[PDB]
Amino acid sequence: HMYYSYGNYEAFARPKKPENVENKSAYLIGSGLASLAAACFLIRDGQMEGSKIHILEELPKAGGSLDGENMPLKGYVVRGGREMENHFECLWDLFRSIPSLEIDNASVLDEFYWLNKEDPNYSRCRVIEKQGQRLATDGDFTLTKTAIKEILDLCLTNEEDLDDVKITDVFSDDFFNSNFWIYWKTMFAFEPWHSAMEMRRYLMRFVHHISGVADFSALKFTKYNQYESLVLPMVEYLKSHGVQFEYDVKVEDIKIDVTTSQKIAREILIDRNGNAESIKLTINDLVFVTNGSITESSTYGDNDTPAPPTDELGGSWTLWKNLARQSPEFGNPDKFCQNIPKKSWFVSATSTTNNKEIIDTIESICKRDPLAGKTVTGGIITINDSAWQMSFTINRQQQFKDQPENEISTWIYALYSDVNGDYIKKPITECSGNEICQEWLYHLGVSTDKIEDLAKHASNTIPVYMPYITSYFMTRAIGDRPLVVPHQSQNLAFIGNFAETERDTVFTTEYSVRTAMEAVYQLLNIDRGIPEVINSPFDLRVLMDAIYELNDHQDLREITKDSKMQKLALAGFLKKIKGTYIESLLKEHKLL
Amino acid sequence: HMYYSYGNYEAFARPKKPENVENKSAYLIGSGLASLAAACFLIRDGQMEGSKIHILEELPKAGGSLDGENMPLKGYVVRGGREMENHFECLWDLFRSIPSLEIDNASVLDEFYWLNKEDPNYSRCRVIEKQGQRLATDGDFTLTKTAIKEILDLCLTNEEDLDDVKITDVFSDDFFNSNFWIYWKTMFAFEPWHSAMEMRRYLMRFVHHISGVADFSALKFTKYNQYESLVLPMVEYLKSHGVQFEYDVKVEDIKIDVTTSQKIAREILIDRNGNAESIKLTINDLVFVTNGSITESSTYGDNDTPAPPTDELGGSWTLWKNLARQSPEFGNPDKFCQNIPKKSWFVSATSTTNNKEIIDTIESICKRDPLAGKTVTGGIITINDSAWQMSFTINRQQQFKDQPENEISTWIYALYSDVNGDYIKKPITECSGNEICQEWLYHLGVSTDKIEDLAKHASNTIPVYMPYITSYFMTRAIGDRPLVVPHQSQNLAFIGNFAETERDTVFTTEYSVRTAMEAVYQLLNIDRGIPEVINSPFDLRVLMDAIYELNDHQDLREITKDSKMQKLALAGFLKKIKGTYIESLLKEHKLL
Ligand SMILES: Cc1cc2nc3c(=O)[nH]c(=O)nc-3n(C[C@H](O)[C@H](O)[C@H](O)COP(=O)(O)OP(=O)(O)OC[C@H]3O[C@@H](n4cnc5c(N)ncnc54)[C@H](O)[C@@H]3O)c2cc1C
Ligand SMILES: Cc1cc2nc3c(=O)[nH]c(=O)nc-3n(C[C@H](O)[C@H](O)[C@H](O)COP(=O)(O)OP(=O)(O)OC[C@H]3O[C@@H](n4cnc5c(N)ncnc54)[C@H](O)[C@@H]3O)c2cc1C
C-alpha cells in the first residue's frame, strides 16, 4: 500500500487527502521518536484531526531514547548522543515541516542546516592511547587485503543467508586488528557477537561516507540535546494541532483478531492511574506499536552510587511478548531481550564539571576550547588500549539551554562491561559516577595525584545502566522483526527500530522516522512516494570511491602490485577498457 | 562557486541571504523560460528586490518557445509540445514555489502532480503506417545485437572524443532500421546528421525511462499549453514581487571587458521604441544572456498560405555573434545557426477543427474520445511510412482555456522538409495549412474524396516555419557553448539551451531551469546545493533494467544463446557469482 521514490518531484509534492480519513483515529503506544513522527505524519499528510490522535506514554515526559534533562537529586544526564547525516531522507522530510523553537520563521531543518554549515563537525583527534596520546596511525584504516576481501564478501552475501550469523563468523584477525574496526565498532557500538546482517546493512547504507568515517567529517549535530532540539519542537507542533498526550498509561496487551483473511486490533488493555481499563477499537482506529525499547528498565546512579544492574522486562518488552503470542508474524522479542552477554554495553555516564584543569586537559587532546560553544571533540574519542574499550564525546557546549556557561558535560560509554578497568580495577557495572570519571580521567593523562579529588569533588558524574542498549544489534533471523504493516493487517502497524523494513539500518533516528512514515502511508493509503534508502551502494561512482578509500588511497596498480594473478587480470581488463569512458571514470575517482 | 547535491536534505533546505545582495541588480536578456526561471531564483533564493530585476523582451509578450495563443488573423497555434518527466530536478525545485493559477493554495507542481496522477499519460497507439494501420511490431525495439552494441559503445565513448561527430558516424543500418530509432528520433526530434554527443547524453540521461519509451508511460503533461500553465503563473509571481518587465526592447550588444584577470559586463546597448540607448553597468549589475533561440525569425502562414521560409538572423543570433567577437570563451554561434541542411525540420502546424468526421477518425486510431478532456494520443503518433516523416499529437483538450468545448487542436511536425509528400506531392515548406492538413488526413485513413474538403473548409491549420528549430542538436565541439558562468566572469552568465553544463540534455525545459539556477547561484554565491542530473546512468539497477529492456525482454542466457564466445564468458561469470547478492540482483531485474 505504498511505493518508494527518489528525487525532487516526489519530495516537494503534497499528497491528496487520504480517503475516509475524517472518520479515523490513531493510538500510538509510546512517545519516543517513532510515535511522535507518526503523529506528525498523521497530521501533515494524513490530514487527521489532532483530537483524534492519542499518544500513550508510561513515563512522565515524552521523548524516549532522545532524553536530556537535569534529573533532580542527580545532575545533567544524556543517555546518548545523536550522530546524524545528510541522507536521513525520511527524517528531513519530517523536520522541514516542524517549526524551530530557536529561530523565527524557520524549520528545525533550517536551524540544523545553517548551524552545521556555520560550525561544521570534524574531529582533530579520534583515537588515543597510553593515557592521552593520539594514535600514530589515526586516519588510516590499516586493512589488509584479506580484511578488505572479507568486507566485500560480507556485502556480496545475500541477506537471507545471514540468519543468526555473528560478526566474528564472517571476519578474521586482520579485520579485528584494523583501525577500521576501531572506528566502526566504537562509532556504531557494534559488538563482536552482534548481527552480521546488520553490519552488512551498515556497510552498504553509509558507503557514501567512508571518506569521512575516521575524522567524523560526515556527521552533523543539533545545537542542544535531542530532547530540546528534536522532541520539544515536535511536541509543540503536535500540541498546536490539538494532539492528545496521555501520560502515565501503561499498555499491557492489544487484543487482535488474526483470522484467515484479516488482522484487526480490537482492544487496548491499559493501566491508567493504577486502574486497569480498556480501549475498544473499530477498524478505523489505527494502532502504532513501538515494539521493544533499548532504554527500557534503565536504572540511574549518582556520583557516589553505581547504577544498579537489572534484567527486568518492562512494559515495552512484555507488550511485545504478549503480541508475539497472537501471531509469529508479529516477531520474536526474545531474540533481542534475552541472552544478552555479560560483556555487552550497559553503562553510560554524563560527567559535568566547571573545573579548569579537566577542561584544559580536554582542550590539550581535542585541540578546541570546550567552552567556546562550537564543536569540541567532533564526536567520540576512543581510548584504544582501555580495558573497558571506553569512548567519550563532548558536543557543542552547553548541551542544555539552562546550563551554566562555565560548565561542560561529557558523555562516556564502554563496550566491555565485565572487565577490570586499568585505574579502577573493577567492571564498569560496579562503579559509581566518580569511579567512571576516575577511570576516564586516567586515560586523559591526568596526574594520578589529582584524579580522585577531581573526580569526587570537582565533577558530578551520573551513570546509567540500560540492560537493553545493545538489543538492536543482537543476532536475528528474517521474521524476528515484524513488518511495519504485517500481512492483511487493517489497523495495526509496528514502528521503531525493532520493526522490519528494507535495507535501512537500526540504531538510527532515521529508522524510526522511516517506520513511522511507512506505517502512516500504508494504513491511510497516502498517495505520495516514500523516499527509498539512499542508493549509494548501487552508485558506480560511490563504489569506486569505496574501493579507493578502503585500500588507504591506492589505485588499482598499487593494490595488485603483489600478485601475478592480480596483475594479469588488471592488465587485461585495462587494455579492454583503454581510452573509454570507463577508464576516464576510474581516473576521475583516483583508481587509475 | 557552487556544488552539486542530491537527496532531501539539500532539497528542503533554504539558503541564507547571499552576501551584499541588497546592493545588486539583475538584467535578463530575453523572457523565455530561462530568463523567467532565473528571475524567480533571484527572488526566492537570492532575495533580490524585485524592482532591481529587469527582464528585457523584444516581442510583445513573454514566454518564448513555450507559446500558445489564438493568434489574430489566423487561429490557434502551439509552436510545440512539452513532454515532461519526474526527474526534472531543477524545474520541480522551481515550480513547487510558483502558485498555481487554477487551484487555490496549491503550487504549479501540486496541480501538475495531482493531474498526472488523475489522468496518467500513456499511448494506446504509437506508430501507424499504410494510411492509419498500427505498426504490427509496435512496442518492441527490434534492435539487433550489433545495434545494441553500437548503443553501448556510444555510451562508452568519452564525450571529449565526440567533437563534431554525427549520429550516422556511430551507427549503422541495423540501428536505423530498428523501431528504437523510430521512437527515439521522433519523440526527441533527432536527425541523422545531428550531434552524436547529444544523442549519448540523451541515452544516459533518460536511461531510467527505457521501459516507458514506446508507450510514453514516463511522460507527463500540463493541463493547458505551456504559456498558460507555466509562463503565466511565473509572470504573475514575478509581478506580485515587483519584477520589471520591459517589452519591445532589442539588445544588440553587451560591452564586456575581457582582461587578464576578469570578465565584466560594462554596457547593454539596446533599441527601445526605435531609440538606440545604453544601460551602464557596475560590477553589481548581473547580466543573464539567453544566447541563441530555436524560435527566432519564425514566420507564420494560415490555412491558405504557406509560412514563408527564411534564413534571417534575428536579434538573438546577432547578439550571440556580437558576444562571440569579444571572447571565444563565449561560444561559437555559427556552429548552430549556419549550415542547417535543407532536409532539417522547419515546419510545425496546428490544425483546429470541430468536425465530427476528423475527430472520429482520430478516436478510431488513438482509442480515446478526443473531446473528453483527458489524454488523447498520449504523445506524438508517428506515421512511419510517410515521406515527410510526419508525427502528430493531441494533448488534453482543450489546450486553451477559452477554446470552444467542441473543438480540438492537433500539433503536427515533419522531420524531412525537402521531400515530396505522399498525397500533397510537394515539400512541406511549400504547403499551406490546409495542404499539411490534407497530407495528414491522408495518413489517418480518411477517404480521398473527403480529404480536401475537410481540410480546406472544415479545419483551420496554421503553419509555422522556424529556421532554427533543430539548432540545439547541430554537431558541436566542446567550447562551442559558453559556460553558464565563464572563467573569471564577475557579472555575466549564459543561460538557456545553448549554454554549457554537465551531462544534462538540451531541447528540454529542465535544461533552461538548470542553467538559470546555476547562473543565479554562482553569481550570487548562494549557499545551497544544486541538484545534480539524476544519477540513473550510474545506478546498477537502472543499467540492469536497460540491458533487459534493450534486448526486448530477454535474460542473459537468451542474449548469448547464439555464440560460443558469449556462452563461455556467461557460464564462467555465472559460476563465479553463483549464490551471491550479484546473482540475486540479476534475477530481481529479470536478467537471469
Ligand atoms: C545511547 C543511545 C545512542 C544513540 N545514538 C544514536 C546515533 O548515533 N544516531 C541516531 O540516529 N540515533 C541514535 N540514538 C537514537 C535511537 O535510534 C533511538 O532508538 C531513537 O530515539 C528512536 O526512538 P524510538 O521511539 O524508536 O524508541 P524509544 O525511544 O525506545 O521509544 C520508547 C518509548 O515508548 C515508551 N513505551 C514503551 N513501552 C510502553 C508501554 N507499554 N506503554 C507506554 N509507553 C511505552 C517508553 O517509555 C519510551 O518513551 C541513540 C539512542 C541511545 C539511547
Ligand atoms: C517545437 C518545440 C518543441 C519543444 N519540445 C519540448 C519537449 O519535448 N520537452 C521540453 O522539456 N521542452 C520542449 N521545448 C521547450 C524548449 O526547451 C525551449 O527552448 C524552452 O522554452 C526553453 O526556453 P528558453 O528561454 O531557454 O529559450 P527561448 O524560449 O528560445 O527564449 C528566447 C526568448 O528571448 C527573446 N530574445 C532573444 N534574443 C533577444 C534580444 N536580443 N532582445 C530581446 N529579447 C530577445 C525571444 O524573443 C524569446 O522570447 C520545445 C520547444 C519547441 C519550440
Short mmCIF file of C-alpha atoms in Angstrom, two decimals, chain B residues 193-481:
data_model
loop_
_atom_site.label_atom_id
_atom_site.label_comp_id
_atom_site.label_asym_id
_atom_site.label_seq_id
_atom_site.Cartn_x
_atom_site.Cartn_y
_atom_site.Cartn_z
CA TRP B 193 23.31 14.34 -39.13
CA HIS B 194 22.87 15.66 -35.58
CA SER B 195 25.37 15.64 -32.71
CA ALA B 196 26.25 12.13 -31.53
CA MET B 197 27.47 13.73 -28.30
CA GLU B 198 23.95 14.97 -27.56
CA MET B 199 22.47 11.59 -28.50
CA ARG B 200 24.80 9.92 -25.99
CA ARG B 201 23.73 12.50 -23.40
CA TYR B 202 20.11 11.57 -24.15
CA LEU B 203 20.85 7.84 -23.85
CA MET B 204 22.47 8.32 -20.45
CA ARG B 205 20.05 10.96 -19.14
CA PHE B 206 16.76 9.08 -19.66
CA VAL B 207 18.08 5.52 -19.25
CA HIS B 208 15.73 5.14 -16.29
CA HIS B 209 12.73 5.53 -18.64
CA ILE B 210 13.58 2.96 -21.34
CA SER B 211 10.67 0.77 -20.21
CA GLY B 212 8.32 3.66 -20.99
CA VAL B 213 9.81 4.94 -24.23
CA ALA B 214 7.48 3.09 -26.61
CA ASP B 215 4.15 3.72 -24.83
CA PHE B 216 5.01 7.19 -23.42
CA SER B 217 4.15 5.94 -19.92
CA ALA B 218 7.01 8.04 -18.49
CA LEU B 219 5.78 11.34 -19.95
CA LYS B 220 3.83 13.96 -18.00
CA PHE B 221 1.93 16.98 -19.30
CA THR B 222 0.38 20.18 -18.02
CA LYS B 223 -3.34 20.87 -18.28
CA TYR B 224 -3.13 23.70 -20.82
CA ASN B 225 -0.41 24.85 -23.19
CA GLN B 226 2.90 25.85 -21.65
CA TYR B 227 2.13 29.56 -21.92
CA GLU B 228 -0.96 29.30 -19.71
CA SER B 229 0.32 26.51 -17.43
CA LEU B 230 3.97 27.56 -16.99
CA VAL B 231 4.54 31.11 -18.25
CA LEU B 232 1.51 32.90 -16.80
CA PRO B 233 1.91 31.59 -13.20
CA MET B 234 5.60 32.54 -13.24
CA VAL B 235 4.83 36.00 -14.62
CA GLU B 236 2.12 36.54 -12.01
CA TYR B 237 4.54 35.53 -9.24
CA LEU B 238 7.26 37.84 -10.58
CA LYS B 239 4.83 40.76 -10.92
CA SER B 240 3.50 40.17 -7.41
CA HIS B 241 7.15 40.60 -6.40
CA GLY B 242 7.54 43.81 -8.42
CA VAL B 243 9.76 42.40 -11.18
CA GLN B 244 10.35 44.87 -14.02
CA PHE B 245 9.09 43.66 -17.41
CA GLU B 246 10.41 45.89 -20.22
CA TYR B 247 8.79 44.93 -23.53
CA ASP B 248 9.80 45.78 -27.10
CA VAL B 249 13.49 46.31 -26.28
CA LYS B 250 16.05 44.62 -28.54
CA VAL B 251 19.54 44.06 -27.17
CA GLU B 252 22.15 44.36 -29.91
CA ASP B 253 25.39 44.17 -27.92
CA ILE B 254 26.85 43.96 -24.43
CA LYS B 255 30.13 45.83 -23.95
CA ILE B 256 32.28 43.44 -21.90
CA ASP B 257 35.86 43.87 -20.68
CA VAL B 258 37.77 40.59 -21.05
CA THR B 259 41.01 41.29 -19.19
CA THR B 260 43.78 39.00 -17.98
CA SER B 261 42.03 38.80 -14.60
CA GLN B 262 38.30 39.48 -15.10
CA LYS B 263 35.35 39.41 -17.48
CA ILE B 264 33.00 42.27 -16.61
CA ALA B 265 29.88 43.37 -18.48
CA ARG B 266 30.06 47.15 -18.89
CA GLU B 267 27.16 48.19 -21.10
CA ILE B 268 23.86 46.98 -22.55
CA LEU B 269 23.32 48.58 -25.97
CA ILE B 270 19.58 48.45 -26.68
CA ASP B 271 16.90 49.60 -29.13
CA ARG B 272 13.80 50.66 -27.17
CA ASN B 273 10.95 52.19 -29.20
CA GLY B 274 13.24 52.76 -32.17
CA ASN B 275 15.66 54.73 -29.96
CA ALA B 276 19.20 53.41 -29.54
CA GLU B 277 20.07 53.75 -25.85
CA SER B 278 22.62 52.43 -23.37
CA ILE B 279 22.43 50.80 -19.94
CA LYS B 280 25.58 51.42 -17.91
CA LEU B 281 26.51 48.51 -15.64
CA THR B 282 28.56 48.23 -12.47
CA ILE B 283 30.03 45.02 -11.08
CA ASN B 284 26.82 44.60 -9.03
CA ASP B 285 24.57 44.51 -12.13
CA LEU B 286 24.37 40.87 -13.19
CA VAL B 287 23.50 40.09 -16.82
CA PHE B 288 21.82 36.81 -17.80
CA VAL B 289 22.05 36.24 -21.57
CA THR B 290 19.83 33.64 -23.24
CA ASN B 291 22.30 33.09 -26.06
CA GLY B 292 20.57 31.80 -29.17
CA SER B 293 16.97 30.81 -29.81
CA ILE B 294 15.31 27.95 -31.66
CA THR B 295 12.20 30.06 -32.33
CA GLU B 296 13.99 33.16 -33.66
CA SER B 297 12.86 34.53 -37.04
CA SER B 298 9.79 32.28 -37.04
CA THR B 299 7.32 33.01 -39.82
CA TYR B 300 3.63 32.11 -39.86
CA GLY B 301 1.19 31.15 -42.59
CA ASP B 302 -2.51 30.32 -42.48
CA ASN B 303 -4.99 27.80 -43.89
CA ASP B 304 -4.41 29.03 -47.46
CA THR B 305 -0.84 30.40 -47.30
CA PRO B 306 2.48 28.66 -46.55
CA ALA B 307 4.77 30.02 -43.88
CA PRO B 308 7.48 31.88 -45.87
CA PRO B 309 10.89 30.21 -45.49
CA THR B 310 13.63 32.43 -44.12
CA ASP B 311 17.33 32.37 -43.28
CA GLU B 312 17.24 35.61 -41.29
CA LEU B 313 19.39 36.05 -38.21
CA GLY B 314 17.30 37.89 -35.64
CA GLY B 315 18.33 39.71 -32.50
CA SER B 316 19.22 36.57 -30.54
CA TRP B 317 21.69 35.15 -33.06
CA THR B 318 23.24 38.51 -33.92
CA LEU B 319 23.66 39.20 -30.20
CA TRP B 320 25.40 35.85 -29.66
CA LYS B 321 27.53 36.62 -32.72
CA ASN B 322 28.45 40.03 -31.28
CA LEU B 323 29.36 38.43 -27.94
CA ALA B 324 31.50 35.80 -29.68
CA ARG B 325 33.66 38.57 -31.15
CA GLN B 326 34.64 39.60 -27.61
CA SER B 327 35.95 36.21 -26.41
CA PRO B 328 36.00 32.62 -27.75
CA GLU B 329 35.01 31.58 -24.21
CA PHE B 330 31.57 32.98 -25.12
CA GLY B 331 30.99 30.26 -27.72
CA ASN B 332 30.62 29.93 -31.47
CA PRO B 333 27.02 30.56 -32.59
CA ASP B 334 27.79 29.83 -36.26
CA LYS B 335 28.07 26.12 -35.43
CA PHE B 336 24.34 26.20 -34.60
CA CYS B 337 22.71 28.88 -36.80
CA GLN B 338 24.55 28.27 -40.10
CA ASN B 339 24.73 25.32 -42.50
CA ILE B 340 21.37 23.90 -41.39
CA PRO B 341 20.60 21.29 -44.08
CA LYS B 342 17.58 21.71 -46.34
CA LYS B 343 16.18 18.39 -45.10
CA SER B 344 16.07 19.55 -41.47
CA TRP B 345 12.84 20.11 -39.57
CA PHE B 346 11.45 23.61 -40.15
CA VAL B 347 7.65 23.46 -40.27
CA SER B 348 5.18 22.83 -37.46
CA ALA B 349 1.41 23.11 -37.75
CA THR B 350 -1.66 23.46 -35.52
CA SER B 351 -4.86 22.11 -37.09
CA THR B 352 -8.05 23.10 -35.27
CA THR B 353 -11.43 21.58 -36.04
CA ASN B 354 -14.80 20.71 -34.57
CA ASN B 355 -15.74 18.41 -37.46
CA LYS B 356 -17.06 15.10 -36.17
CA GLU B 357 -15.57 13.06 -39.03
CA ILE B 358 -11.97 14.06 -38.28
CA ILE B 359 -12.44 13.67 -34.52
CA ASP B 360 -13.97 10.22 -35.00
CA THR B 361 -11.13 9.19 -37.33
CA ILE B 362 -8.76 10.25 -34.55
CA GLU B 363 -10.75 8.27 -31.97
CA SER B 364 -10.54 5.16 -34.16
CA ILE B 365 -6.72 5.38 -34.10
CA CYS B 366 -5.92 6.65 -30.59
CA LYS B 367 -8.81 4.69 -28.96
CA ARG B 368 -9.82 7.67 -26.79
CA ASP B 369 -12.53 10.30 -27.11
CA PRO B 370 -10.53 13.41 -28.15
CA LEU B 371 -13.13 15.77 -26.64
CA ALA B 372 -13.31 14.04 -23.24
CA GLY B 373 -10.77 16.42 -21.69
CA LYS B 374 -8.41 13.61 -20.67
CA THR B 375 -5.45 12.11 -22.53
CA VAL B 376 -5.99 11.63 -26.26
CA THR B 377 -2.97 10.28 -28.14
CA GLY B 378 -0.67 10.20 -25.10
CA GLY B 379 2.01 11.86 -27.20
CA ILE B 380 3.02 12.00 -30.83
CA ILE B 381 1.73 9.36 -33.21
CA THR B 382 4.38 8.72 -35.87
CA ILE B 383 3.45 7.87 -39.46
CA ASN B 384 6.33 5.50 -40.18
CA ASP B 385 5.96 5.27 -43.97
CA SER B 386 5.33 8.99 -44.52
CA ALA B 387 7.75 10.74 -46.86
CA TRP B 388 7.86 13.83 -44.62
CA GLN B 389 8.47 11.50 -41.64
CA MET B 390 5.46 13.13 -40.02
CA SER B 391 4.24 12.90 -36.44
CA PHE B 392 1.30 14.49 -34.66
CA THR B 393 -0.15 14.69 -31.16
CA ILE B 394 -3.36 15.78 -29.46
CA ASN B 395 -2.86 16.73 -25.82
CA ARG B 396 -5.68 17.02 -23.28
CA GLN B 397 -8.35 19.12 -24.99
CA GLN B 398 -8.74 21.91 -24.97
CA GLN B 399 -5.14 23.12 -24.72
CA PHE B 400 -6.51 26.69 -24.46
CA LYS B 401 -8.75 27.79 -21.59
CA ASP B 402 -11.10 29.81 -23.83
CA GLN B 403 -11.31 27.33 -26.71
CA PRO B 404 -14.82 26.07 -27.54
CA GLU B 405 -15.61 22.74 -25.90
CA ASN B 406 -16.42 21.05 -29.24
CA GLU B 407 -13.07 21.90 -30.86
CA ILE B 408 -9.74 20.09 -30.87
CA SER B 409 -6.29 21.30 -31.92
CA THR B 410 -3.68 18.89 -33.29
CA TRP B 411 0.07 19.55 -33.39
CA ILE B 412 1.89 18.26 -36.48
CA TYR B 413 5.56 18.24 -37.43
CA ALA B 414 7.77 16.62 -40.05
CA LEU B 415 11.41 15.56 -39.84
CA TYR B 416 12.07 15.85 -43.61
CA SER B 417 11.39 19.20 -45.28
CA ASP B 418 12.73 18.80 -48.86
CA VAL B 419 10.78 15.68 -49.90
CA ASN B 420 7.56 15.37 -51.89
CA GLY B 421 4.67 14.21 -49.74
CA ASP B 422 2.65 11.09 -50.43
CA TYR B 423 -0.68 12.89 -51.03
CA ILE B 424 0.41 16.52 -51.48
CA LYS B 425 3.50 15.71 -53.57
CA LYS B 426 5.27 18.95 -52.56
CA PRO B 427 7.78 19.57 -49.75
CA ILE B 428 6.13 20.70 -46.53
CA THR B 429 7.89 24.08 -46.77
CA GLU B 430 5.80 24.78 -49.91
CA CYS B 431 2.47 23.78 -48.32
CA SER B 432 -0.31 25.92 -46.90
CA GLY B 433 -2.05 25.00 -43.66
CA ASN B 434 -4.82 23.10 -45.41
CA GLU B 435 -2.24 21.26 -47.53
CA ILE B 436 -0.36 20.00 -44.47
CA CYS B 437 -3.77 19.06 -43.06
CA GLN B 438 -4.53 17.19 -46.30
CA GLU B 439 -1.31 15.17 -46.22
CA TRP B 440 -2.01 14.45 -42.54
CA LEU B 441 -5.62 13.34 -43.07
CA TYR B 442 -4.43 11.05 -45.88
CA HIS B 443 -2.30 9.02 -43.44
CA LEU B 444 -5.20 8.90 -40.96
CA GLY B 445 -7.09 6.74 -43.45
CA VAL B 446 -9.62 9.43 -44.43
CA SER B 447 -11.32 8.72 -47.75
CA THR B 448 -9.57 10.63 -50.54
CA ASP B 449 -12.93 12.07 -51.61
CA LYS B 450 -13.40 13.94 -48.32
CA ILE B 451 -9.77 14.88 -47.56
CA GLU B 452 -9.60 18.16 -49.50
CA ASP B 453 -13.00 19.45 -48.37
CA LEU B 454 -12.42 18.50 -44.72
CA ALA B 455 -9.02 20.20 -44.79
CA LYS B 456 -9.91 23.44 -46.57
CA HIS B 457 -13.36 24.25 -45.15
CA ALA B 458 -13.75 22.11 -42.00
CA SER B 459 -10.31 22.74 -40.46
CA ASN B 460 -8.17 25.78 -39.70
CA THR B 461 -4.49 24.82 -39.86
CA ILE B 462 -1.82 27.40 -39.00
CA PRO B 463 1.73 26.53 -40.16
CA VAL B 464 4.99 27.85 -38.69
CA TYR B 465 8.46 27.98 -40.27
CA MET B 466 11.21 28.02 -37.64
CA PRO B 467 14.60 28.07 -39.43
CA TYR B 468 16.42 27.24 -36.16
CA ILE B 469 14.13 24.67 -34.52
CA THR B 470 16.77 21.93 -34.93
CA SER B 471 19.65 24.19 -33.88
CA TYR B 472 20.10 22.61 -30.43
CA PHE B 473 21.23 19.30 -31.93
CA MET B 474 23.72 20.53 -34.56
CA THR B 475 27.13 18.87 -34.47
CA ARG B 476 29.23 20.70 -31.89
CA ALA B 477 32.61 20.61 -30.18
CA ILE B 478 33.50 21.31 -26.56
CA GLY B 479 33.72 25.09 -26.32
CA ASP B 480 31.06 25.95 -28.90
CA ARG B 481 28.67 26.55 -25.99
#
